[PDB]
Structure formats: C-alpha cells, structure tokens
Backbone as numpy.savetxt, mean C-alpha at the origin, in Angstrom:
# Nx Ny Nz CAx CAy CAz Cx Cy Cz
-27.99 20.91 -16.45 -29.06 20.46 -15.52 -29.05 18.94 -15.38
-27.86 18.36 -15.21 -27.73 16.90 -15.08 -26.91 16.30 -13.94
-25.58 16.35 -14.01 -24.74 15.94 -12.86 -23.63 16.92 -12.57
-23.47 17.26 -11.29 -22.43 18.21 -10.89 -21.31 17.46 -10.22
-20.08 17.85 -10.52 -18.92 17.15 -10.02 -18.38 17.86 -8.80
-18.65 17.28 -7.63 -18.10 17.78 -6.39 -16.64 17.42 -6.39
-15.79 18.40 -6.13 -14.34 18.16 -6.07 -13.95 17.66 -4.70
-13.08 16.66 -4.67 -12.56 16.14 -3.41 -12.07 17.40 -2.69
-12.07 17.38 -1.35 -11.28 18.36 -0.61 -9.84 18.33 -1.12
-9.23 17.17 -0.91 -7.89 16.77 -1.28 -8.13 15.34 -0.85
-7.44 14.38 -1.44 -7.59 13.01 -0.98 -6.35 12.62 -0.17
-6.43 12.79 1.14 -5.21 13.02 1.89 -4.41 11.80 2.31
-3.13 11.85 1.96 -2.28 10.71 2.18 -1.91 10.46 3.66
-1.26 9.32 3.85 -0.83 8.90 5.16 0.21 9.85 5.77
1.30 10.13 5.05 2.26 11.14 5.51 1.56 12.47 5.68
0.55 12.73 4.85 -0.17 13.99 4.96 -0.83 14.05 6.32
-1.28 12.89 6.80 -1.99 12.80 8.08 -1.06 12.65 9.29
-0.03 11.79 9.17 0.94 11.55 10.25 2.27 12.24 10.03
2.88 12.65 11.13 4.09 13.42 11.09 5.25 12.47 10.99
6.38 12.98 10.50 7.55 12.15 10.32 8.04 11.46 11.59
7.67 12.00 12.75 8.19 11.48 13.99 7.25 10.45 14.56
5.97 10.78 14.51 4.93 9.85 14.88 5.15 8.56 14.13
5.63 8.71 12.89 5.77 7.60 11.98 6.96 6.70 12.34
8.16 7.28 12.44 9.34 6.55 12.89 9.09 5.90 14.26
8.22 6.54 15.02 7.75 6.08 16.31 6.65 5.03 16.41
5.80 4.97 15.40 4.92 3.85 15.13 5.74 2.68 14.61
6.58 2.96 13.61 7.41 1.92 13.01 8.28 1.14 14.00
8.98 1.88 14.87 9.96 1.29 15.76 9.18 0.46 16.75
8.22 1.15 17.38 7.32 0.58 18.36 6.72 -0.74 17.91
6.10 -0.70 16.73 5.32 -1.84 16.24 6.22 -2.99 15.85
7.42 -2.67 15.40 8.38 -3.69 15.06 9.15 -4.11 16.32
8.88 -3.47 17.45 9.38 -3.98 18.72 8.56 -5.22 19.05
7.25 -5.07 19.00 6.33 -6.14 19.35 6.20 -7.17 18.26
6.38 -6.78 17.02 6.03 -7.69 15.95 7.18 -7.89 15.01
8.25 -8.52 15.51 9.51 -8.59 14.75 9.51 -9.51 13.51
8.39 -10.18 13.24 8.24 -10.96 12.01 7.35 -10.25 10.99
6.62 -9.26 11.48 5.67 -8.54 10.64 6.27 -7.23 10.13
6.14 -7.02 8.82 6.67 -5.83 8.15 5.66 -4.70 8.23
6.05 -3.49 8.71 5.03 -2.43 8.73 4.90 -1.83 7.34
3.68 -1.85 6.82 3.43 -1.50 5.40 2.34 -0.44 5.26
2.54 0.49 4.33 1.47 1.40 3.99 0.92 1.19 2.55
-0.38 0.81 2.49 -1.06 0.64 1.20 -2.15 1.65 0.88
-1.95 2.37 -0.21 -2.84 3.43 -0.58 -3.31 3.37 -1.99
-4.41 4.05 -2.19 -5.00 4.18 -3.50 -4.38 5.40 -4.16
-3.93 5.20 -5.39 -3.41 6.25 -6.23 -4.41 7.40 -6.23
-3.88 8.62 -6.25 -4.68 9.84 -6.16 -5.63 9.97 -7.36
-5.20 9.54 -8.53 -6.08 9.62 -9.71 -6.95 8.42 -9.95
-6.92 7.46 -9.03 -7.61 6.19 -9.22 -9.09 6.39 -9.56
-9.56 5.62 -10.55 -10.90 5.84 -11.07 -11.80 4.61 -10.99
-11.24 3.41 -10.82 -12.07 2.19 -10.85 -12.20 1.49 -9.50
-11.07 1.32 -8.81 -11.02 0.54 -7.60 -11.47 1.33 -6.40
-12.13 0.66 -5.43 -12.55 1.44 -4.26 -11.37 1.66 -3.37
-11.65 2.28 -2.24 -10.68 2.55 -1.20 -10.43 1.23 -0.49
-9.26 1.05 0.10 -9.08 -0.05 1.05 -9.67 0.43 2.39
-10.14 -0.46 3.26 -10.82 0.07 4.46 -9.84 0.55 5.51
-8.68 -0.09 5.53 -7.56 0.36 6.31 -6.39 0.83 5.43
-5.35 1.34 6.10 -4.14 1.83 5.43 -2.85 1.10 5.83
-2.76 0.74 7.11 -1.60 0.09 7.73 -1.79 -1.41 7.86
-0.72 -2.13 7.62 -0.81 -3.54 7.62 0.50 -4.05 8.12
0.45 -5.21 8.77 1.62 -6.02 9.06 1.51 -7.22 8.18
2.62 -7.53 7.53 2.76 -8.64 6.64 3.91 -9.47 7.21
3.62 -10.75 7.51 4.62 -11.73 7.92 5.75 -11.80 6.89
7.00 -11.71 7.36 8.18 -11.51 6.50 8.50 -12.63 5.50
7.82 -13.75 5.63 8.09 -14.86 4.72 7.29 -14.71 3.46
6.13 -14.05 3.58 5.20 -13.81 2.47 5.82 -13.13 1.25
5.56 -13.67 0.06 6.11 -13.07 -1.14 5.16 -12.04 -1.71
5.67 -11.20 -2.60 4.89 -10.09 -3.09 3.62 -10.57 -3.75
3.74 -11.62 -4.56 2.62 -12.05 -5.38 1.49 -12.65 -4.56
1.85 -13.25 -3.41 0.86 -13.64 -2.40 0.21 -12.38 -1.84
0.92 -11.25 -1.89 0.37 -10.00 -1.36 -0.74 -9.45 -2.25
-0.47 -9.35 -3.54 -1.50 -8.96 -4.51 -2.80 -9.73 -4.31
-2.75 -11.06 -4.31 -3.97 -11.87 -4.11 -4.69 -11.38 -2.86
-3.92 -11.16 -1.81 -4.50 -10.81 -0.52 -5.19 -9.45 -0.57
-4.62 -8.52 -1.35 -5.24 -7.20 -1.55 -6.53 -7.30 -2.35
-6.49 -8.00 -3.49 -7.71 -8.20 -4.28 -8.81 -8.83 -3.44
-8.46 -9.77 -2.55 -9.47 -10.30 -1.63 -9.95 -9.24 -0.64
-9.01 -8.52 -0.03 -9.40 -7.55 0.99 -10.33 -6.54 0.32
-9.98 -6.12 -0.89 -10.81 -5.14 -1.63 -12.07 -5.79 -2.22
-12.20 -7.11 -2.05 -13.24 -7.92 -2.71 -13.28 -7.74 -4.22
-12.20 -8.02 -4.92 -12.16 -7.67 -6.32 -12.62 -8.79 -7.21
-13.15 -8.38 -8.36 -13.39 -9.22 -9.51 -12.11 -9.94 -9.87
-12.21 -11.15 -10.40 -11.01 -11.82 -10.88 -10.57 -11.20 -12.20
-11.46 -10.43 -12.80 -11.26 -9.87 -14.13 -11.01 -8.37 -14.08
-10.93 -7.83 -12.87 -10.66 -6.42 -12.66 -9.17 -6.23 -12.67
-8.70 -5.12 -13.23 -7.27 -4.86 -13.36 -6.70 -4.25 -12.08
-5.70 -4.89 -11.47 -5.14 -4.37 -10.21 -3.63 -4.50 -10.14
-2.95 -3.36 -10.07 -1.51 -3.30 -9.86 -1.15 -2.69 -8.50
0.09 -2.94 -8.08 0.59 -2.57 -6.74 2.03 -2.11 -6.84
2.26 -0.81 -6.82 3.58 -0.32 -7.11 4.36 -0.07 -5.82
5.69 -0.22 -5.90 6.62 0.09 -4.81 7.86 0.76 -5.41
8.14 2.00 -5.00 9.19 2.82 -5.63 9.20 2.73 -7.15
8.00 2.82 -7.70 7.79 2.78 -9.12 7.86 1.40 -9.74
7.61 0.35 -8.97 7.69 -0.96 -9.57 6.46 -1.79 -9.41
5.98 -2.33 -10.54 4.91 -3.29 -10.47 5.48 -4.50 -9.77
4.77 -4.94 -8.75 5.21 -6.04 -7.91 4.92 -7.48 -8.34
4.55 -7.66 -9.61 3.89 -8.87 -10.18 4.80 -9.90 -10.76
6.07 -9.53 -10.86 7.13 -10.38 -11.36 8.06 -10.67 -10.20
7.57 -10.46 -8.98 8.43 -10.37 -7.81 8.39 -11.59 -6.88
9.58 -12.17 -6.68 9.78 -13.49 -6.08 10.07 -13.44 -4.59
10.79 -12.42 -4.16 11.37 -12.41 -2.81 10.32 -12.21 -1.74
10.65 -12.53 -0.48 9.66 -12.23 0.52 9.75 -10.76 0.95
8.67 -10.27 1.57 8.53 -8.88 1.95 9.78 -8.35 2.65
10.25 -9.06 3.68 11.54 -8.82 4.38 12.71 -8.45 3.47
12.86 -9.18 2.37 13.91 -8.91 1.40 13.64 -7.58 0.71
12.37 -7.33 0.41 11.91 -6.09 -0.22 11.99 -4.93 0.76
11.59 -5.18 2.00 11.56 -4.20 3.08 12.80 -3.51 3.50
13.90 -4.25 3.49 15.17 -3.69 3.86 15.67 -2.83 2.70
15.56 -3.36 1.48 16.03 -2.67 0.29 15.14 -1.51 -0.16
13.85 -1.60 0.13 12.87 -0.71 -0.47 12.12 0.21 0.48
12.35 0.08 1.79 11.58 0.81 2.80 11.89 2.29 2.79
11.00 3.09 3.35 11.18 4.52 3.35 12.20 4.84 4.44
12.71 6.06 4.41 13.38 6.73 5.52 12.63 6.53 6.83
11.30 6.59 6.78 10.51 6.56 8.01 10.35 5.18 8.64
10.76 4.13 7.92 10.54 2.74 8.37 9.50 1.91 7.60
8.32 2.50 7.32 7.24 1.79 6.63 7.65 1.41 5.23
7.12 0.31 4.74 7.19 0.05 3.33 5.94 0.71 2.72
6.13 1.51 1.68 5.04 2.25 1.03 4.67 1.60 -0.30
3.37 1.36 -0.51 2.91 0.83 -1.81 1.57 1.39 -2.30
1.38 1.46 -3.61 0.19 2.10 -4.10 -0.49 1.11 -5.00
-1.82 1.13 -5.03 -2.50 0.27 -5.93 -3.32 1.09 -6.89
-3.61 0.49 -8.06 -4.43 1.12 -9.07 -4.70 0.18 -10.22
-5.76 0.46 -10.95 -6.16 -0.28 -12.14 -5.30 -0.03 -13.41
-4.21 0.74 -13.28 -3.18 0.97 -14.35 -1.75 0.75 -13.80
-0.74 0.76 -14.67 0.66 0.70 -14.18 1.53 1.87 -14.65
0.92 2.83 -15.33 1.66 3.97 -15.79 0.84 5.19 -15.54
1.51 6.32 -15.37 0.86 7.55 -14.95 1.43 8.74 -15.72
C-alpha cells in the first residue's frame, strides 16, 4: 500500500521509430544541405536511472568539433550538475579520451545508415 511501479511500454529507440530507408534518406538529404554538419543520433541508455531524457534526438555537429567539446555541450543541453556522472559511448567507447574531430570519428565510426550513433548514461559499463 505504498508505491506501484508502472512499467514503461518499451522505451523506443530511433531505429525502432524510423525505417532503414527513411534514415539513409534523412542522412543523405541532410548532408546534402549541411556538408559541414555531421548527422548524429544521441540517446539515453535503456537502463538509465539518473539522467533525464534529452529533449531532442537528432543533431548536427560541425565537423571541426572534437568529442570532448561534445560532452560539455550535452551536459549543458541536459542542464547537468558539474558533479553528476555523464558518459557518452560510441560503438562501445567512452568518448572522454578522444582528440579527433567528429568528421574523423564519423567516417570511421558511422552506422550503415549514415548517422553517427551515441548513447549517454551515468555509468560506462553494462
């Protein structure tokens, strides 16, 4: 007689929402108009327990920007505590020791579909 835990429907991902073709078609299209901006997908880990949702999912990041400038920008967008724990993984990698600009990461690390995919969470292991 205290608190009941409503189960998420499912916490539905971007690919879950968009089709593989719509995606290659957003990617191509958007990088037609924005050839300096990297098309990126940023999501909250499915088990995430501390950090809120980001308000959007898709982002363009100017290709000169380095990864570590990206983290700062996410903590700001999320309005985070300076003392709150926040990691950002890409193909299983914490991006916090990372020097290169997004463009360098984007060609090497991008999905089949075109987007660069990254996940954030208050931990680095799962």
